[PDB]
Design a protein around this motif. Structure first.
Motif, PDB file in Angstrom:
ATOM      1  N   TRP A   1     -12.131   1.564  12.720  1.00 17.39           N
ATOM      2  CA  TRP A   1     -13.308   2.608  12.863  1.00 17.39           C
ATOM      3  C   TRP A   1     -14.336   1.551  13.646  1.00 17.39           C
ATOM      4  N   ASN A   2     -15.132   2.425  14.586  1.00 23.69           N
ATOM      5  CA  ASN A   2     -16.027   1.596  15.534  1.00 23.69           C
ATOM      6  C   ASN A   2     -17.293   1.214  14.825  1.00 23.69           C
ATOM      7  N   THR A   3     -17.535  -0.164  14.825  1.00 23.01           N
ATOM      8  CA  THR A   3     -18.735  -0.829  14.163  1.00 23.01           C
ATOM      9  C   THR A   3     -19.894  -0.295  14.482  1.00 23.01           C
ATOM     10  N   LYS A   4     -20.196   0.299  15.833  1.00 28.82           N
ATOM     11  CA  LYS A   4     -21.533   0.794  16.093  1.00 28.82           C
ATOM     12  C   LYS A   4     -21.952   1.880  15.272  1.00 28.82           C
ATOM     13  N   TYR A   5     -20.705   2.655  14.542  1.00 26.89           N
ATOM     14  CA  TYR A   5     -21.264   3.847  13.578  1.00 26.89           C
ATOM     15  C   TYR A   5     -21.517   3.516  12.338  1.00 26.89           C
ATOM     16  N   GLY A   6     -21.295   2.308  11.897  1.00 28.01           N
ATOM     17  CA  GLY A   6     -21.785   2.049  10.684  1.00 28.01           C
ATOM     18  C   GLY A   6     -20.855   1.963   9.393  1.00 28.01           C
ATOM     19  N   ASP A   7     -20.076   2.900   9.498  1.00 30.30           N
ATOM     20  CA  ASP A   7     -19.149   3.405   8.109  1.00 30.30           C
ATOM     21  C   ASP A   7     -18.116   4.357   8.817  1.00 30.30           C
ATOM     22  N   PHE A   8     -16.820   4.416   8.286  1.00 30.64           N
ATOM     23  CA  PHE A   8     -15.702   5.162   8.465  1.00 30.64           C
ATOM     24  C   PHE A   8     -16.468   6.780   8.647  1.00 30.64           C
ATOM     25  N   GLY A   9     -16.783   7.102   7.497  1.00 30.35           N
ATOM     26  CA  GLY A   9     -17.253   8.432   7.381  1.00 30.35           C
ATOM     27  C   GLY A   9     -18.135   9.155   8.618  1.00 30.35           C
ATOM     28  N   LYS A  10     -19.193   8.413   9.108  1.00 27.38           N
ATOM     29  CA  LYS A  10     -19.722   8.339  10.225  1.00 27.38           C
ATOM     30  C   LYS A  10     -18.914   8.451  11.508  1.00 27.38           C
ATOM     31  N   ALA A  11     -18.025   7.472  11.550  1.00 23.67           N
ATOM     32  CA  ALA A  11     -17.339   7.245  12.875  1.00 23.67           C
ATOM     33  C   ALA A  11     -16.536   8.211  12.975  1.00 23.67           C
ATOM     34  N   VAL A  12     -15.753   8.992  11.921  1.00 27.49           N
ATOM     35  CA  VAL A  12     -15.019  10.169  12.256  1.00 27.49           C
ATOM     36  C   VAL A  12     -15.562  11.405  12.941  1.00 27.49           C
ATOM     37  N   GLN A  13     -16.918  11.356  12.979  1.00 18.65           N
ATOM     38  CA  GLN A  13     -17.794  12.310  13.413  1.00 18.65           C
ATOM     39  C   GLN A  13     -17.795  12.243  15.189  1.00 18.65           C
ATOM     40  N   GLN A  14     -17.314  11.069  15.628  1.00 21.22           N
ATOM     41  CA  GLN A  14     -17.647  10.707  16.853  1.00 21.22           C
ATOM     42  C   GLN A  14     -16.513  10.606  17.707  1.00 21.22           C
ATOM     43  N   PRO A  15     -16.409  10.966  19.061  1.00 19.71           N
ATOM     44  CA  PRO A  15     -15.316  11.099  19.761  1.00 19.71           C
ATOM     45  C   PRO A  15     -14.799   9.794  20.134  1.00 19.71           C
ATOM     46  N   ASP A  16     -15.540   8.937  19.822  1.00 17.89           N
ATOM     47  CA  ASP A  16     -14.741   7.290  20.083  1.00 17.89           C
ATOM     48  C   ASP A  16     -14.841   6.438  18.828  1.00 17.89           C
ATOM     49  N   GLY A  17     -14.844   7.379  17.607  1.00 19.30           N
ATOM     50  CA  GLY A  17     -15.125   6.783  16.267  1.00 19.30           C
ATOM     51  C   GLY A  17     -13.992   5.904  15.849  1.00 19.30           C
ATOM     52  N   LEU A  18     -12.724   6.039  16.140  1.00 18.96           N
ATOM     53  CA  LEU A  18     -11.547   5.461  15.372  1.00 18.96           C
ATOM     54  C   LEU A  18     -10.628   4.891  16.460  1.00 18.96           C
ATOM     55  N   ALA A  19      -9.988   3.820  16.316  1.00 15.64           N
ATOM     56  CA  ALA A  19      -8.864   3.521  17.146  1.00 15.64           C
ATOM     57  C   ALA A  19      -7.654   3.242  16.108  1.00 15.64           C
ATOM     58  N   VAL A  20      -6.602   3.846  16.239  1.00 10.93           N
ATOM     59  CA  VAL A  20      -5.530   3.984  15.721  1.00 10.93           C
ATOM     60  C   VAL A  20      -4.333   3.371  16.292  1.00 10.93           C
ATOM     61  N   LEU A  21      -3.879   2.261  15.847  1.00  7.94           N
ATOM     62  CA  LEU A  21      -2.752   1.289  16.548  1.00  7.94           C
ATOM     63  C   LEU A  21      -1.327   1.953  15.825  1.00  7.94           C
ATOM     64  N   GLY A  22      -0.691   2.516  16.613  1.00  9.50           N
ATOM     65  CA  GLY A  22       0.638   3.244  16.239  1.00  9.50           C
ATOM     66  C   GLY A  22       1.745   2.290  16.442  1.00  9.50           C
TER      67      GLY A  22
ATOM     68  N   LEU B   1      -6.919  12.701  14.386  1.00 13.98           N
ATOM     69  CA  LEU B   1      -6.257  12.429  13.182  1.00 13.98           C
ATOM     70  C   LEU B   1      -5.079  13.398  13.023  1.00 13.98           C
ATOM     71  N   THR B   2      -4.035  12.952  12.711  1.00 16.31           N
ATOM     72  CA  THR B   2      -2.885  13.737  12.587  1.00 16.31           C
ATOM     73  C   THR B   2      -2.796  14.443  11.308  1.00 16.31           C
ATOM     74  N   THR B   3      -3.571  14.245  10.352  1.00 13.73           N
ATOM     75  CA  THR B   3      -3.685  14.973   8.927  1.00 13.73           C
ATOM     76  C   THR B   3      -4.955  15.876   8.965  1.00 13.73           C
ATOM     77  N   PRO B   4      -5.188  16.877   8.190  1.00 15.90           N
ATOM     78  CA  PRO B   4      -6.393  17.263   7.857  1.00 15.90           C
ATOM     79  C   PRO B   4      -7.221  16.230   7.724  1.00 15.90           C
ATOM     80  N   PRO B   5      -8.612  16.125   7.928  1.00 17.03           N
ATOM     81  CA  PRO B   5      -9.254  17.261   8.745  1.00 17.03           C
ATOM     82  C   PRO B   5      -9.033  17.486  10.176  1.00 17.03           C
ATOM     83  N   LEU B   6      -8.172  16.504  10.841  1.00 16.24           N
ATOM     84  CA  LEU B   6      -7.526  16.711  12.309  1.00 16.24           C
ATOM     85  C   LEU B   6      -8.749  16.404  13.293  1.00 16.24           C
ATOM     86  N   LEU B   7      -9.944  15.529  12.959  1.00 16.81           N
ATOM     87  CA  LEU B   7     -10.939  15.391  13.687  1.00 16.81           C
ATOM     88  C   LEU B   7     -10.586  14.632  14.970  1.00 16.81           C
TER      89      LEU B   7
END
Ligand SMILES: N=C(N)NC(=N)NCc1ccc(S(N)(=O)=O)cc1
Ligand SMILES: N=C(N)NC(=N)NCc1ccc(S(N)(=O)=O)cc1
Ligand SMILES: [Zn+2]
Length: 257
Positions: A120-141, A194-200
């Protein structure tokens, strides 16, 4: 009550999570010939030397290896990313058979499993805030194929008996996620979800080209896990993957020629 069964699986999710039919859903098929090399994609930086794993949890969907994300201990930077993304957890998706299990596909090829390192992007402070943003997460697959064992996976494999059923956890300290990486960091990237609900729709996906190989015995141990809780009817935790979703108005970029 979403899951991966006939009655609650991916084709049903949209009824509770209408974003399932959104404009930037994941996973996708990676058409390798249509992806375009982006020479400006600046070097990717995986900095996991100070990672602090804490615990492993069967959450009824998958198992998560959780990290201390209260400081910049294990971070992802560079590549398509602006700023610093902290590792919070990793998990896998896998099949009932070696011929399926991955979420992303490559020219329609399924792999036996797929590892997701979630940041999660540290500029958003917490994971829960980050998932509400279009650039909140980076997932390495990272794709898994069945062949030779992955030595750095074995510590994970061996604890799974202790977390067989939903809601079980076990302390899981001093695990080094660098032992799960392939040699090359060449990747594809695109904006998704996200690939699972809530599919954000909050994820920058970074999918490595080079799969890791794991042994048949290692993946067989994944398949002994249970979706159910202890004292409930046994349902093996297999085929916990969402199939590929429409690409819509997206381009997949490659870091490599
Ligand atoms: C059984 N289907 N009971 C309930 C149920 C709960 C949620 C969903 S989902 N997939 O839309 O979240 C489907 C079905
Ligand atoms: N938003 C949440 N449900 N919160 C959470 N702890 N994790 C949710 C979560 C994290 C990663 C992924 S994946 N498969 O896209 O990597 C799916 C769902
Ligand atoms: Zn995942």
């Amino acid at each position: 009550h979403w899951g991966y069964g006939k009655h609650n699986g991916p084709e049903h999710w949209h009824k509770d999570f209408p974003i399932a039919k959104g404009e930037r859903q994941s996973p996708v098929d990676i058409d390798t010939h249509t992806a375009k090399y982006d020479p400006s994609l600046k070097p990717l930086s995986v900095s996991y030397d100070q990672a602090t794993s804490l615990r492993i949890l069967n959450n009824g969907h998958a198992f998560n290896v959780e990290f201390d994300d209260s400081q910049d201990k294990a971070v992802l930077k560079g590549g398509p990313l602006d700023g610093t993304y902290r590792l919070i957890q990793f998990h896998f998706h896998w099949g009932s058979l070696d011929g399926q299990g991955s979420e992303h596909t490559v020219d329609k090829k399924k792999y036996a499993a797929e590892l997701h390192l979630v940041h999660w992007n540290t500029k958003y402070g917490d994971f829960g805030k980050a998932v509400q943003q279009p650039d909140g997460l980076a997932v390495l697959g990272i794709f898994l194929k069945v062949g030779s064992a992955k030595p750095g996976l074995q510590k994970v494999v061996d604890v799974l008996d202790s977390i067989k059923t939903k809601g079980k956890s076990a302390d899981f300290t001093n695990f080094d996620p660098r032992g799960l990486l392939p040699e090359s960091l060449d990747y594809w990237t695109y904006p998704g979800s996200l690939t699972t609900p809530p599919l954000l729709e909050c994820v920058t996906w970074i999918v490595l080209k080079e799969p890791i190989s794991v042994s048949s015995e290692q993946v067989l141990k994944f398949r002994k896990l249970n979706f159910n809780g202890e004292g409930e009817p046994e349902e093996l935790m297999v085929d916990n993957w969402r199939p590929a979703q429409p690409l819509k108005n997206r381009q997949i970029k490659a870091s490599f020629k």
